[PDB]
């Protein structure tokens, strides 16, 4: 498969402006999971980086 989503099981760790923040039980579409920790994605229509360690993808 190909993981490319960010499902937050807990709050968001986005402390920066160039990042993106999600909430508990949320689905996010990742645009670039290439990285060893921080991946660049977007929630709904908001673009920003997120913690790939805090949340995990969702293969649907």
């Amino acid at each position: 498969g190909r993981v490319r989503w960010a499902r937050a099981l807990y709050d968001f760790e986005a402390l920066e402006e160039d990042e993106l923040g999600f909430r508990s039980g949320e689905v996010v579409e990742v645009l670039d999971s290439s990285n060893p920790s921080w991946w660049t994605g977007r929630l709904h229509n908001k673009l920003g980086l997120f913690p790939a360690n805090y949340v995990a993808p969702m293969m649907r």
Partner: peptide, 11 residues
């Protein structure tokens, strides 16, 4: 508790 470091952001 997942710990993320911003010192490794997409670079």
């Amino acid at each position: 508790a997942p710990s993320i470091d911003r010192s490794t952001k997409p670079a």
